[PDB]
């Protein structure tokens, strides 16, 4: 997808002139560059394809941070985590999607598991993940029967294995994910995306049995939206995030220092 060439534009003046408009119409202003420059013809021939949605959305980024410690004293209980799936707590990805009313995409999901040693060695280690759609029984324990997964998407990683990935199709009960919402679940709390965006949760858990090595596991989890579509653009976030689902921005004991920077006088660039 390309710009047109630009023609040569003859130096002229006339009673006809498009340089004037009514921006108040809502329509964008007097469109044409050849109107006020006596141009030479140029093969303006620079592709917009990097500017495509399947480009701009369609680069991966990190989403969330599954940090865990391997507890010893009840290894069997504690050594798992669960995270509520959202695009709302890493700013760059958030701001890609905080750009529209709604968006739809299939998802590359990519896992960057990392083991950090608090001990002289780590040995072999294996780690489980599960997508927990809502109303799956959430694992309560590193020994919970819920680690069995006859139909839940559960996947494994271990020391020395390559980065896991999967393709997750577009999920919503609706046509597109709400980037924002203007009301409630029907009895009137959780205003906005905390209503609509119940994807349930990701989960993780050490699969190797009790062993002597005190370790931290950290998974950085990444995603890229592809086969994307998006719906009615909306203005970018001006200030630091605060509250995942909620658009809150007035932070506690703080002030609204936006991306705009002041200057001494408006006659000085």
């Amino acid at each position: 997808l390309v710009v047109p060439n630009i023609n040569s534009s003859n130096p002229t003046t006339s009673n006809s002139a498009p340089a004037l408009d009514a921006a108040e119409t809502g329509h964008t202003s007097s469109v044409q560059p050849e109107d006020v420059i006596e141009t030479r013809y140029v093969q303006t021939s620079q592709t917009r394809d990097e500017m495509s949605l399947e480009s701009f959305l369609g680069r991966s980024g990190c989403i969330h941070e599954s940090k865990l410690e391997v507890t010893l004293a009840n290894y069997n209980k504690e050594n798992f985590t669960v995270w509520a799936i959202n695009l709302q707590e890493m700013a760059q990805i958030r701001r890609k999607f905080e750009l529209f009313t709604y968006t739809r995409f299939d998802s590359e999901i990519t896992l960057v598991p990392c083991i950090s040693a608090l001990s002289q060695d780590i040995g072999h280690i294996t780690m489980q993940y599960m997508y927990v759609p809502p109303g799956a029984p959430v694992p309560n324990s590193r020994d919970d029967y819920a680690w069995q997964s006859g139909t839940n998407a559960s996947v494994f990683w271990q020391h020395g294995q390559a980065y896991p990935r999967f393709s997750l199709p577009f999920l919503s009960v609706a046509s597109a994910y709400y980037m924002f919402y203007d009301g409630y679940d029907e009895q009137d709390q959780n205003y906005g995306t905390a209503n609509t965006n119940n994807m349930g949760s990701l989960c993780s858990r050490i699969v190797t049995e009790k062993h002597i090595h005190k370790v931290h596991i950290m998974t950085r989890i990444y995603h890229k939206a592809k086969h994307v579509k998006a719906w009615c653009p909306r203005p970018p976030r001006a200030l630091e995030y605060t509250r995942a689902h909620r658009t809150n921005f007035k932070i506690e004991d703080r002030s609204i220092q936006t991306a705009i920077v002041t200057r001494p006088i408006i006659t000085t660039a």
Binding site: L1, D49, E54, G58, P169, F170, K224, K226, H227, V228
Partner: peptide, 25 residues
């Protein structure tokens, strides 16, 4: 068939179509 912007043939092979995650313009 070959790639329209290009000079070679390549096409899907993974099973279910949504899982591809790579689109034309």
């Amino acid at each position: 068939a070959q790639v329209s912007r290009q000079n070679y043939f390549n096409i899907n092979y993974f099973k279910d179509a949504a899982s591809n995650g790579a689109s034309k313009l």
